[PDB]
Design a binder for these strands. Structure first.
Ligand SMILES: [Mg+2]
Ligand SMILES: [Mg+2]
Ligand SMILES: [Mg+2]
Ligand SMILES: [Mg+2]
Ligand SMILES: [Mg+2]
Ligand SMILES: [Mg+2]
Ligand SMILES: [Mg+2]
Ligand SMILES: [Mg+2]
Ligand SMILES: [Mg+2]
Ligand SMILES: [Mg+2]
Ligand SMILES: [Mg+2]
Ligand SMILES: [Mg+2]
Ligand SMILES: [Zn+2]
Lengths: 38, 94, 131, 141, 136, 71
RNA sequence: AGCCAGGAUGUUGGCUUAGAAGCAGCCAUCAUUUAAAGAAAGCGUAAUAGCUCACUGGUCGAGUCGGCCUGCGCGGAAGAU
């Protein structure tokens, strides 16, 4: 998990989801790509 | 062909024209020929869609004001500093 | 499938062969292979050439357009993926039944040689042919 | 038709059997035998040409035996012994490598057209010549 | 870094930056960056943004820089009290008003120039947009 | 491309010679040797082969020297 | 958007070298068969191999996909009684 002020889709499998008032990215291919806005 | 609907302005100046543009209209004028120049007002969003094409500037286009047809051409255009909006259009009647 | 012009220009290419053809058989080859499908299409060139328009337009209003012209009993062609193969040389040529011989050549889905009906036939193995 | 199991369509210039490091390491660590290429390879090569790279199948099963079949040379290596040029492309738009006669290719097209697809011989001409044009060869009328 | 070759006077008053801009058109190439905010552009930010957009198109096409840093800026040295004259000239800026076109391109696809102008705009302190040529 | 054909002819042996040596699993026990083969390229194989070619040709040249009465 | 099928042909390419074979970087991108398939968009490999994607068929069957101008809210946001 990388906590950065700007979160973007880095691959084709990344998805934007808003969970509990937080924008975060999740993908099923590369676990390095999961990330949240903090 | 391109057909534009316009209305004759009732007042002019700095304040009157700033009110037109806050209501999504803008001023223009038709001059040239033998008659006196005619100051009009005409809808913004409609004439913005027309002028995105490249033959808006190279074609005789009619303006329907007071219910009568007049053939004019676009001579000058005055556009907003940084927004995608128009401010004034000069017409020369043909 | 492309825009409406192709909805009108591919169908008009069909009418060339069906006008002056013969008995035709239909095969539903949904699950094949292109290298295997190559031979079936390249077999056409061996006998006389590519003169058969072998397009597949089996949508409800993509092949039925030419039905009122000829092969009226092919108006019941509403089911799923199929193929069209016709015969110019000779009435009821081997192409009505060579797929039956080719049925065993990894052609599991072969539509059971139902074909089109010029003399109003049914599902049968009409193997008779003057050689 | 049978799927690829452990085999590839490639080898060195077929000129000789030469069951040596040039050929063996393609499949030697996969089992079977390497020196078996000594007699199995010039059986069909003694009459074709000495130096033509032609691919063959190396279909091998768990019985430690492999079946092999030869074929025509590929497109690029074909335009070397009769095209009169041993170089290739690398800048087709920058320059032309040389001249090539179009009547030459379709005379030797049916050499390759035996397995090559196409409606007819003339159809193959544009295919074989197009990659010849990529080489910089100028199609002589 | 852009800088006047020779100048009449060594220093300038501070001034103000009111008004809108002259030069609000794409008059050289096909695409450009129009400034939407107001501020100053130094010579090190103009040079850094030109390196980012030149390296993005692989030096295919033409690029016009359309602003010039002709105004000197001075700073007093560190830990000195007030007064005792004016400071020493340290760098040069260009004053920017809403509407100026800052760069140009021509000779690239319209889709590739948007990406090049996007990497360039990340080096400047002023909000900008992407504009195209007009008939009139 | 004056002499690129010689480079391609040299290419056309290690193009498949390398396979049984990359995965032979005798030169990989130490860490350095695998990447040595990967980066230092194909020196040992082609150099030994070219040495053998040189030895054969030098053996050929030595002969045909004891003859007289002919030009 | 799902759910099934195909998703091809000489390019082990010459171009950089043992390798770039669709997939590190250097020119090109024709042609064939086809309802369709790019001299390869992605993954994955040392080359491999393979798995996808474009495109086209099949059931379903009603809308659907993106930009532009704007109003109000979200994150970025850590200190000492
Ligand atoms: Mg929680
Ligand atoms: Mg006044
Ligand atoms: Mg007044
Ligand atoms: Mg006032
Ligand atoms: Mg003043
Ligand atoms: Mg002031
Ligand atoms: Mg000013
Ligand atoms: Mg000024
Ligand atoms: Mg200025
Ligand atoms: Mg906030
Ligand atoms: Mg905010
Ligand atoms: Mg406190
Ligand atoms: Zn991802």
């Amino acid at each position: 998990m990388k906590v950065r002020a700007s979160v973007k889709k880095l691959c084709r499998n990344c998805k934007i989801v808003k969970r509990d008032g937080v924008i975060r990215v999740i993908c099923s291919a590369e676990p390095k790509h999961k990330q949240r806005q903090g | 062909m391109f057909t534009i609907n316009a209305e004759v302005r009732k007042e002019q100046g700095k304040g009157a024209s700033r009110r037109l543009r806050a209501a999504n209209k803008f001023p223009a004028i038709i001059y040239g020929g033998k008659e006196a120049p005619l100051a009009i007002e005409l809808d913004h969003d409609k004439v913005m869609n027309m002028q995105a094409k490249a033959e808006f500037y190279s074609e005789v286009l009619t303006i329907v004001v007071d219910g009568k047809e007049i053939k004019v051409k676009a001579q000058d255009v005055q556009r907003h500093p940084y927004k995608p909006k128009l401010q004034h259009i000069d017409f020369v009647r043909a | 499938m492309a825009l409406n012009l192709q909805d009108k220009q591919a169908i008009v290419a069909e009418v060339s062969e069906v006008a002056k053809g013969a008995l035709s058989a239909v095969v539903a080859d949904s699950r094949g292979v292109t290298v295997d499908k190559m031979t079936e299409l390249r077999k056409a060139g061996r006998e006389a050439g590519v003169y058969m328009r072998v397009v597949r337009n089996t949508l409800l209003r993509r092949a039925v357009e030419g039905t009122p012209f000829e092969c009226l009993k092919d108006a019941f062609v509403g089911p799923t993926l199929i193929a069209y193969s016709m015969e110019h040389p000779g009435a009821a040529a081997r192409l009505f039944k060579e797929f039956a011989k080719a049925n065993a050549k990894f052609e599991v889905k072969a539509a059971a040689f139902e074909g089109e009906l010029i003399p109003a036939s049914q599902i049968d193995r009409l193997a008779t042919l003057p050689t | 038709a049978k799927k690829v199991q452990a085999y590839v369509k490639l080898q060195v210039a077929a000129g000789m059997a030469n069951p040596s490091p040039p050929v063996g390491p393609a499949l030697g660590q996969q089992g079977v035998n390497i020196m078996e290429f000594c007699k199995a390879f010039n059986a069909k090569t003694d009459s074709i040409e000495k130096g033509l790279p032609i691919p063959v199948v190396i279909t091998v099963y768990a019985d430690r035996s492999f079946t092999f079949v030869t074929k025509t040379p590929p497109a690029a290596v074909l335009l070397k012994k009769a095209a009169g040029i041993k170089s290739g492309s690398g800048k087709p738009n920058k320059d032309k490598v040389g001249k090539i006669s179009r009547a030459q290719l379709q005379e030797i097209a049916q050499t390759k057209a035996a397995d090559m697809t196409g409606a007819d011989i003339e159809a193959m001409t544009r295919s074989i010549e197009g990659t010849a044009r990529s080489m910089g060869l100028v199609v002589e009328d | 870094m852009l800088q006047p070759k020779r100048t009449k006077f060594r220093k300038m008053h501070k001034g103000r930056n009111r008004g809108l801009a002259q030069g609000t058109d794409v008059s050289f190439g096909s695409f450009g960056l129009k400034a939407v905010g107001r501020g100053r552009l130094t010579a090190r930010q103009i040079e850094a943004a030109r390196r980012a957009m030149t390296r993005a198109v692989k030096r295919q096409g033409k690029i016009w820089i359309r602003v010039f840093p002709d105004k000197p800026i001075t700073e007093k040295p560190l830990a000195v009290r007030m007064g005792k004259g004016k400071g020493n000239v340290e760098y040069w800026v260009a004053l920017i008003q809403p509407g100026k076109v800052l760069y140009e391109m021509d000779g690239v696809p319209e889709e590739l120039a948007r990406e090049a102008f996007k990497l360039a705009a990340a080096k400047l302190p002023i909000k900008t947009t992407f504009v195209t040529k007009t008939v009139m | 491309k004056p002499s690129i054909v010689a480079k391609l002819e040299a290419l056309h042996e290690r193009h498949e010679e390398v396979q049984a040596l990359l995965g032979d699993a005798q030169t990989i026990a130490d860490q350095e040797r695998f990447r040595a083969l990967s980066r230092e390229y194909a020196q040992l194989s082609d150099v030994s082969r070219c040495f053998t070619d040189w030895q054969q040709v030098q053996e050929d040249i030595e002969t045909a020297q004891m003859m007289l009465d002919d030009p």
